[PDB]
Design a binder for this molecule. Structure first.
Ligand code: NA
Ligand code: NA
Ligand code: NA
Ligand code: NA
Ligand code: NA
Ligand code: NA
Ligand code: NA
Ligand code: NA
Lengths: 330, 329, 331, 330
């Protein structure tokens, strides 16, 4: 957003820092086929230089299959085939041990008279039995909400008009040899559904495949902590990002940064392990780059640490452990 | 502090316009602090709904730790932490009612007051414990004596934290069970939710005659999850206003403050604690705020906020929130 | 000569009451007066015995006889978590914190004329349904009740299935030091473990934390699957005969049991992994303390020979038993 | 007596039943390169007819990297690269919706003076903090045991001589589009570490990729319930299997069968969800193929169901829900 970028890790360590960036338009025609698995086997759709900008025309989580409140999700969708992905985008010079920095500049709704979509998919959500939390109870009612929206507000209903706080649900890089579905978050990023990953945020992803192989998709107009019903307000967007490369920075999990905080993003089940992963990664980050002594960092976070529950519905839950940048002062 | 006029405690509390009697629950009045919360303890004080109570709480270690050279494993015996004040009896309280506890203020108690943070062996969020049973050596045994005042917590040369006090253990008695002071459950307990401080009203479901309110474990500050096992534990002068709401069936504790309402669920694994909180919030929105169930569920998937209380105690605690602006018709 | 293994049991080798002509007490409903739904040190004692004595307990079913027809509706007749009415507390002379109560179950027979067991699907309670802990918004499962005829040989489930009579105690426990835990929860004091192995021919070891021990028993099952997945087993009223003895100064953190072929550490918690960790770790500590094992060898050996029994996966805390065959205890 | 096979699902529904099978020798020379990811992108190494036999020369979980008790696992291994896989094997006619039936005939130790290996790998095991159950404690001691073995016994130590009960730790088929690492079990099979999957067992795996794409590996000379320290007695083997194909049999999870029982194998975290998955699958199996009414099956299993804890160390835990074949009688 403002001048905090000057002190960001991306600007201070990114190799593309002072470059006049080339802006690429990743349209649907360039993408050709959207992907439902994130790995090293997909044919690259674009190759960029670190520091370049990319304007992505993303598709909603249902790849436009739902367009009416009278639609029936169980008849139009097949789990886990949600979150069609743009990519893979190749970053010149990226190799295992590096980090892709993704700065989201803006996110606007795409199409004339744009609509977002929230849905209650049978056997999927936070307060229902699913195919993982296998119960014998009947699934919840099958609902769909077509919500009108603009760059300022989300028109949920007569009673509630929500602010437009867009963010990317699925942001990731390829694993070394595995190919993970677009519904799962892991140590490569993925379907994290962390509300903070929107305009004014920089997400750091660990490279494990040559070229990085950046994937993006599943834009949300807004989202609650946990994305409890299974979906947020899913919409097609024009997401503009700046991608840079940090050389030889060993990360085990995704990290992000914004004007006010730094955050370690862990993903797993049960939810406590996702939280352990995040907090422990944050502690290692504080010791490595911010001069903290390990036990002091641990005990300090027991007084100042902040937690963001991302999703609690996907194959793996996602949690972000934060620390306010004011507490990083030496 | 105008929001109190619209609070559930003021609008439904029977003690609302009373000139309250202020009781001083000193250590001499308390006699013996408790490590179990139930209906078997002898009452220490009886009050009228609307009365104020000035509680002289003891720290989580009951003063057993006073030096950074102390060794927790030699001075503490788990799970005997969080000595409790109470039980306090509310006149007229019976099963089906709710005790509303409004915290007015919290100040450090004693001359040259110090808070305490400790890494207790086999206890904490990033260590094997007696529940998450591992064979690894326990983490180093550490203790921090932190100087503090009504304005700041002097953690170190590098970090000076703001003083945001809150109560770690706030509860009412179960009908027949007696739960230890280290565990949070449907009666409240050791929730360690940072939001339960000055300017908050906590609603607890009565299941025993008289309510039997217990309080303790004051924190000068606390992170989400209380990850190392302890916050900045200190002895305090906690002033509360306790009132009674008649015939309001609650299954779990709820709280309210200037900006939000929250349902507090406690359990393991952490997902279930969160499910409990969110589901309770949804039932609360349907019952008292005119929401249709499925709309509330899908709406919270866009606006719900989550507070990770503790992720170290026998049961983890999570708060599901909704901003009061979204309660408008 | 099947009861030969008892001679080598921990109860016989270390129990203070070994060799005594035991006094047999009849814990009838008239002696019990009121059954309890919470296990702690505040209940009035109903019986005091000497270590080595026998007790014939007339237990009540998990519903305290509230259900007697397949047309009954559990949600209208039961209030959770008030299940498993308990017999006790029984006081053992000399028992104090640091000791262990050894409970050997001799036999379990169905009580009453034309006895019936009961299996039920209670709304918001069970392994494959949302509950008040695993809080879901889905409708509860159908409300079912099965009245099963039974005898000392078989459980007449249906025309198609006749199950063998393998009775065991669901709730066996001792009082905590100061807490009073409900009769539906298992913990480090024993409790509602629902471990099928705790039946005739088994000796359960419980850690004493309250003076006199304060032994509680109840919730007899005619049979039970691993996990007790629907929420209930075949619940029935029984005549359970036990022999209770006392082992002095044997520090245990969790319940343990022993039978003709194995030893087992019983852990209880949520999530289920932690219940299993507790059990296995306790077993490892037991092998190091009493059977001359080196810790890491025991750990790696159990990774090859350890056996696990899923007790319940429905109660407030799940229960898991980690076992080792007695043949592997030989030096 | 192998009389029970006549009533097995493989013999009654397998298309290859009655064929004079062709026996293939899947040697290391045929395999060329062992795989650490299971998916549809690997080049096929062998194509067989349903009913054929395959003699597989498997490699141990460490791909021979450990050969001395003085070896240091953290210096010789890189997690999660364990369990080198043989395959993919193609079954002629296999397509999505089918099931691969894998009957294990025998398993013998391979090599001169064969040795099995048990190891305590840092940050991996049931009773230690790991990278998923992220703790700050020091890892457990780094230990290795070289165990001599033969077709009759496992020479653990002077004090303990264990019986030779071999079984396959990793048995799987390819996902439709994903490629899952060889350390993870899921709905495609994988690193289940279920002791029952040995000689005299038939494992049923759901086909989701054309040709099935069968993968096998990680032979164990023995294993405890949970494989608590992280590893069993890992060894290189000569595993002989008979692979057949069952047409149009919709399965969501792996199933197995032996002389005395049928079992549904679920994999997930936390451990209760793995168990829910298994039991629910068993109930659906009993309703579909054995004439049970759903609620009766559920309540009956609450009296007769048996549970096998497979592993409680891998990225996903594995649990088997069983029912004795005597209770399947109409
Ligand atoms: Na998403
Ligand atoms: Na989404
Ligand atoms: Na606390
Ligand atoms: Na505290
Ligand atoms: Na029970
Ligand atoms: Na029972
Ligand atoms: Na394995
Ligand atoms: Na293995």
């Amino acid at each position: 957003a403002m001048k905090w970028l000057e002190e960001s890790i991306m600007v201070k360590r990114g190799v593309g820092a002072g470059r006049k960036p080339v802006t690429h338009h990743l349209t649907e025609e360039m993408q050709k086929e959207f992907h439902y698995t994130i790995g090293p086997y997909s044919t690259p759709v674009l190759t960029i230089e670190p520091g370049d900008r990319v304007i992505v025309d993303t598709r909603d989580a249902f790849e436009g299959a739902i367009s009416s409140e009278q639609d029936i999700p169980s008849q139009l969708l097949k789990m886990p085939f949600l979150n069609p992905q743009n990519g893979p985008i190749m970053i010149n010079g990226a190799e295992k041990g590096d980090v892709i920095a993704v700065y989201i500049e803006s996110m606007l709704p795409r199409g004339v008279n744009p609509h977002g979509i929230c849905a209650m998919i049978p056997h999927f959500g936070g307060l229902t039995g699913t195919d993982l939390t296998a119960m014998l109870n009947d699934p919840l009612p099958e609902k769909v909400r077509m919500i009108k929206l603009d760059s300022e507000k989300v028109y949920w209903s007569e009673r509630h008009t929500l602010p437009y706080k867009p963010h990317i649900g699925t942001l990731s890089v390829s694993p070394e040899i595995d190919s993970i579905n677009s519904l799962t978050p892991d140590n490569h990023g993925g379907n994290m559904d962390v509300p903070d990953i929107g305009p004014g945020s920089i997400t750091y992803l660990p490279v494990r495949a040559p070229g990085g192989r950046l994937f993006i998709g599943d834009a949300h107009a807004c989202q609650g902590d946990g994305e409890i019903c299974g979906t947020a307000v899913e919409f097609a967007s024009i997401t503009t990002i700046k991608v840079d490369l940090i050389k030889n920075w060993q990360l085990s999990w995704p990290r992000m940064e914004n004007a006010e905080t730094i955050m370690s993003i862990g993903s797993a089940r049960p939810l406590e392990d996702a939280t352990r992963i995040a907090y422990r990664d944050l502690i290692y980050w504080l010791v490595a780059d911010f001069g903290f002594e390990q036990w002091d960092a641990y005990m300090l976070l027991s007084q100042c640490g902040k937690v963001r529950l991302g999703n609690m519905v996907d194959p793996k839950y996602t949690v972000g452990a934060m620390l306010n940048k004011e507490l990083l002062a030496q």
